[PDB]
Swiss-Prot record:
Major site of localization recorded for this protein: nucleus
Protein's name according to its UniProt entry: RNA polymerase I-specific transcription initiation factor RRN11
Subunit organization: Component of the core factor (CF) complex, which consists of RRN6, RRN7 and RRN11. The CF heterotrimer may further dimerize to form a hexamer. RRN11 interacts with RRN6, RRN7 and SPT15.
Note from the entry: Present with 476 molecules/cell in log phase SD medium.
Gene: RRN11
Organism from which the protein derives: Saccharomyces cerevisiae (strain ATCC 204508 / S288c)
Length: 303
DNA sequence: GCATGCATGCATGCATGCATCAGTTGAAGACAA
């Protein structure tokens, strides 16, 4: 009853997405008309926008104005009537289950089986139980079992590493026996930071644009390994090998490295330093409500 | 006929290939019959 961490499937689901986005396109085409293939799905899904430290959202103010009824019954069924037929052609080539699937999604029903629910089979149902027991044991603070789970999981030739916070917290409350925590974190980062589609990202990703998980997690957690102090110039040397260098938040990680080094003219240059990266992190992002707090601290330093 | 496998295609940089101090030297304007 939880998301699976393996690449969803082969099967039907492609032909279903076919039917879906093909029909979508026929209706939206005739709709702009009246208002006046993996690739068809691709263009289709394509032309569309793809007191505390909140990445504040973009709120409503310069946005738009009001609309007034577009769509009576007699006029919707206009736009519906033709594309449904063109659909009657390749519907003739997809399978019965997907005839009825398209039929119902087109009546506006919504399925009550899931892609997981219907992908039957010895092996996957076993993985499903394995991963469940993982997520359960981790909820239970049963770090030992949990760990056993995780290990037998990743042993299996199907699981992609989308279960890393799995370890990153698991191996984290497991001081016991294994290289851990930062080990995993900076490992993830080093491996998946270069070149060396669906079924993806925010908490996994590749290069050229940003990479939540591994990056920021080791990138603060090492600074927490320096709250273990009271290391830094290392974290800021290899933090100081950008660029993605639009990673503004990592600009704030850098400025944090300088406020922690600051804790004689050396300490000056470290406070000068943090003063610089805070605004080069006015790049944009959006942190630290008043930087005048950071700066009141920097004046407690200036003493 | 339908499902598994894996090879073809497509697309962003990169790498191979192929074309694009000192001497004699003359020339120019002033000057005499």
């Amino acid at each position: 009853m939880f998301e699976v961490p393996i690449t969803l499937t082969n099967r039907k689901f492609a032909q279903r997405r076919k039917l879906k986005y093909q029909y979508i396109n026929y209706i939206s085409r005739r709709f702009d008309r009246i208002s006046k293939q993996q690739k068809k799905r691709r263009r289709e899904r394509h032309w569309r926008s793809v007191s505390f430290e909140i990445w504040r959202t973009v709120s409503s103010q310069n946005k738009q104005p009001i609309n007034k009824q577009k769509m009576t019954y007699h006029n919707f069924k206009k736009i519906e009537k033709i594309p449904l037929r063109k659909m009657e052609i390749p519907l003739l080539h997809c399978t019965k289950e997907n005839k009825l699937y398209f039929q119902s999604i087109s009546r506006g029903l919504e399925p009550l089986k899931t892609s997981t629910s219907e992908v039957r089979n010895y092996r996957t149902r076993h993985i499903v139980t394995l991963t469940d027991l993982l997520h359960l044991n981790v909820s239970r603070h049963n770090w030992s079992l949990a760990y056993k789970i995780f290990a037998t999981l990743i042993r299996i030739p199907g699981v992609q590493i989308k279960s890393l916070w799995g370890i990153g917290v698991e191996i984290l409350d497991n001081l016991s026996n294994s290289s851990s925590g930062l080990d995993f974190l900076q490992w993830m980062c080093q491996i998946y930071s270069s070149k060396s589609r669906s079924i993806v990202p925010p908490f996994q990703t590749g290069s050229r644009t940003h990479t939540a998980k591994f990056a920021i997690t080791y990138l603060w957690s090492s600074l927490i390994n320096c709250q273990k102090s009271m290391l830094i110039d290392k974290i800021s040397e290899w933090v100081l090998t950008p660029p993605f260098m639009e990673d503004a938040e990592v600009w704030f990680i850098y400025a944090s490295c300088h406020l922690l080094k600051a804790d004689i003219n050396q300490v000056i240059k470290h406070i000068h330093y943090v003063r610089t990266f805070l605004k080069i992190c006015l790049d944009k992002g959006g942190f630290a409500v008043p930087s005048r707090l950071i700066e009141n601290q920097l004046k407690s330093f200036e003493s």
